[PDB]
Design a protein around this ligand. Structure first.
Ligand SMILES: [Mg+2]
Lengths: 50, 100, 209, 229, 71, 219
RNA sequence: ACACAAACGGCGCGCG
């Protein structure tokens, strides 16, 4: 089902993409995993502990 | 909101009680980001009763862990609502969907 | 009760005690750092060396008195930072994770100053410290006297402690990421772009790649 | 010395905010070389026109409420931060927006002046939700490059910040999107001559051609330093 | 700097530090200016450099102090 | 300031060897170091104009691994050996060179039949070792002027078109404090060249080439 | 007069 959705999307069924170094503009070797993930912040930020 | 959810997002927000709920089938007429007031359908309007329900949103207030709990509206004047509908979002919520 | 047991004076006070000129921070990895170096935040550094700063200020003569010196430090003025750099120019410092496993658990470092608030550690060393960056905190202490400074530099300094004492074997063996990249580099491909040429030496090899 | 000098051979306002541009002819590998540098320079170096001030009709802090409005004050700041404008021949200016009665608000409502430019009048501003409700706010604009946090700004200013003046972070960059492609196009009726295409998305505040030429000029400044040995 | 070499000259880790500190306080407040050149280092390093050369040593230090007492 | 950027007051010339001088720049606007380092790096290996040596016409040796007597190293190695040669040719776009030596001895670039309008970085460079007193070898070799570098992907032997007189470049980017902030970068560069053009002067040329391109977009 | 500043002992929850 995920593969079909990717095809319905705009990406290869593998989900991995090539990328380029923002410093040098040259391409990284072979595709890599690129994705969208849900990320949370924990109530332990540094300034409250240092 | 969370993109890849599990299906608990609506339920948790509602039972948490941090979000406001439509106690009666009604339509909305007011907004101040501090209060919300609802005009209720006749079938739930009581014979010696106003026919309207008003709510006061809790605003910036320190939590037990020193964090604000301010509620926010998610509706507009004249907008309909079923009884039990989500009236106002709270912290980490949107449209009554749990959003950490 | 005040004497006996875990709460007794022996454990409570004598064999372990709170110490001034100390601080705790959250850890981070600085790839740019050399093995002997460590990065620490300016905020902690400014506090930690106040007695040193006052001396340099009065050696500079800029501060009429201690209170004046303290008053200037409140400014956090540029000159303060200039003096702080001079003071910290080579002063060793002590970093320890908790609970310590062994004497390798505590080692000395030379500091560099950072704008943020985390304390930066060399990746190769942290492994010996068993540091995992999932949120580990770390404590810092400064040796004051001449004797301690030489003690810290002579023994505790990281360059000295490449060998484990439980076994005369390198504890410095590279990280997961560092080793893998080299592993990938050292592997061979049966056929590849540019394969089959003759090169005079690494110099052109780097250029060709 | 066989180099043919590239030129900004064509420009395209494919959209009122999105643009295309191409450079040609380019020597071997230079397209990648220039492409990377120009991308890097544009994102960092471009000079921006951005807003950082809010003066309001009586609230005293970011967390204050407001009568007869759909949203809280702080959310207003986020919308304003999103808002962008271009200013003609000026370094800073103050703008004001006044509305009354039940209605939603848009950038067009601002007290616009001919020497100021609003890139998207349709941009959304917070709404009014009472007949007697009214808003009358004032905002200041500045020219800058890069980004600045609000706290750092006031500490640099060090003059008294009166109550009722609210602080927001400056995000100057007129543009944030870069894609560039190198292709082979025919010059010298032969192969091994390169063609470069750039495309970007903007808040509309600058002309794309000015962007590349201004950026290239900036890069020349740093490059010239290497002759100073 | 990191020594890992001067210890060979004196032959002991502990003696290296002990002897070095003895010399260090001389240049710190005791006078007897550094023998090795100065590179905006600190006396701990400067004295450490002197032993790193093998230039300074305990036996020389013992000679240095006793001969100096004089009148 | 709105359209002004910090520039480096650069001081470092450390020629640990004349063939490579260590140079350093400071201060630079945040992030420019990677931009400048990458740009110059790409320029130096790819773009440099230079002369390259690529030809061998030799008796009986059809290909690089066909071999002949009188010399203690294979043709394959010799082709490698001569590639290390570096030479400056004045004016001419290509030049053809001849070598001829005999007897048990090592052979140097000095032995080359030369014009005098051509110069060697290391006349002492050795490209042969001879096995026996009767052993003697002679061949024709070519020098060609060209921009950049190519491998030998282009009856006679040929080798890479390595015009660029340089093969090393390492650049480093680390920060240094201004009186009130430490977000600015240093640039530290090391590179190595055969010495036809000593490293430092070539760097200014590298900047020159880039400047020529940007000048078209000047405002 | 050129000088001190706000912790004693428990409980719960979390942290590596
Ligand atoms: Mg951990």
């Amino acid at each position: 089902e995920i593969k079909e959705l990717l095809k319905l999307g705009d990406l290869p069924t593998s989900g991995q993409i090539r990328l380029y170094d923002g410093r040098t503009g040259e391409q990284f070797e072979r595709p890599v995993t690129v994705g969208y993930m849900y990320m949370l912040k924990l109530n332990h930020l540094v300034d409250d502990k240092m | 909101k969370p993109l890849v959810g599990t299906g608990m997002e609506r339920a948790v927000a509602v039972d948490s009680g941090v979000t406001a709920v439509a106690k009666r089938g009604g339509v909305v007429q007011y907004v101040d980001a501090s209060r919300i007031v609802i005009k209720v359908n006749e079938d739930e309007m009581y014979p010696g009763e106003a026919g309207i329900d008003i709510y006061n949103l809790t605003k910036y207030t320190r939590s037990n862990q020193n964090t604000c709990i301010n509620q926010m509206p998610c509706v507009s004047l004249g907008e309909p609502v079923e009884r039990g509908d989500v009236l106002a979002d709270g912290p980490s919520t949107d449209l009554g969907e749990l959003a950490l | 009760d005040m004497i006996k047991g875990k709460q007794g004076r022996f454990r409570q006070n004598l064999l372990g005690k709170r110490v001034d000129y100390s601080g705790r921070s959250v850890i981070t990895v600085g790839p740019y750092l050399r093995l002997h170096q460590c990065g620490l935040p300016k905020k902690m550094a400014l506090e930690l060396f106040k007695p040193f700063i006052y001396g340099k200020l009065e050696l500079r003569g800029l501060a009429t008195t201690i209170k004046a010196a303290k008053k200037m430090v409140e400014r956090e003025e540029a000159v303060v930072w200039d003096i702080l750099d001079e003071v910290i120019r080579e002063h060793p410092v002590l970093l320890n994770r908790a609970p310590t496993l062994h004497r390798l658990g505590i080692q000395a470092f030379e500091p560099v100053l950072i704008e943020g608030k985390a304390i930066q550690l060399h990746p190769l060393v942290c492994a010996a410290y068993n540091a995992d960056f999932d949120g580990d905190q770390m404590a810092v202490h400064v040796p004051l006297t001449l004797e301690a400074q030489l003690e810290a530099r002579a023994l505790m300094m990281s360059t000295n402690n490449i060998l484990s004492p439980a076994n005369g074997e390198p504890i410095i063996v590279p990280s997961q990421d560092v080793v893998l990249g080299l592993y990938y580099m050292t592997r061979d491909c049966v056929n590849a772009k540019g394969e089959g040429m003759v090169l005079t030496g690494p110099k052109e090899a780097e250029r060709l790649y | 010395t066989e180099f043919l000098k590239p030129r900004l051979v064509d420009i395209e306002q494919v959209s009122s905010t999105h643009a295309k541009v191409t450079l040609e002819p380019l020597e071997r590998g230079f397209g990648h070389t220039l492409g990377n540098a120009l991308r890097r320079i544009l994102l960092s170096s471009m000079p921006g026109c951005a807003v950082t001030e809010v003066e309001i009709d009586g609230v005293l802090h970011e967390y204050s409420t407001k009568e007869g409005v759909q949203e809280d004050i702080l959310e207003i700041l986020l919308n304003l931060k999103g808002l962008a404008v271009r200013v003609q021949g000026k370094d800073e200016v103050i703008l004001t927006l006044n509305k009354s009665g039940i209605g939603p608000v848009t950038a067009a409502d601002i007290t616009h002046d001919g020497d100021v430019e609003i890139v998207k009048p349709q941009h959304v501003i917070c709404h009014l939700t009472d007949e007697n409700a009214s808003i009358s706010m004032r905002i200041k604009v500045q020219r800058g490059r890069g980004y600045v946090p609000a706290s750092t700004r006031i500490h640099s200013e060090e003059d008294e910040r009166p109550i009722g003046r609210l602080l927001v972070d400056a995000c100057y960059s007129p543009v944030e999107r870069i894609a560039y492609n190198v292709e082979a196009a025919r010059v010298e009726q032969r192969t091994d001559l390169d063609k470069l295409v750039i495309e970007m998305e903007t808040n509309g505040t600058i002309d794309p051609e000015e962007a590349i030429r201004r950026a290239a000029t900036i890069l020349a400044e740093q490059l010239e330093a290497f002759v100073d040995l | 700097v990191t020594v890992q070499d001067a210890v060979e000259k004196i032959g002991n880790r502990f003696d290296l530090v002990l002897v070095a500190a003895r010399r260090a306080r001389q240049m710190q407040v005791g006078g007897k200016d550094p023998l090795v050149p100065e590179e905006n280092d600190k006396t701990t390093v400067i004295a450490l450099r002197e032993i790193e050369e093998g230039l300074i040593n305990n036996q020389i230090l013992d000679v240095r102090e006793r001969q100096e007492q004089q009148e």
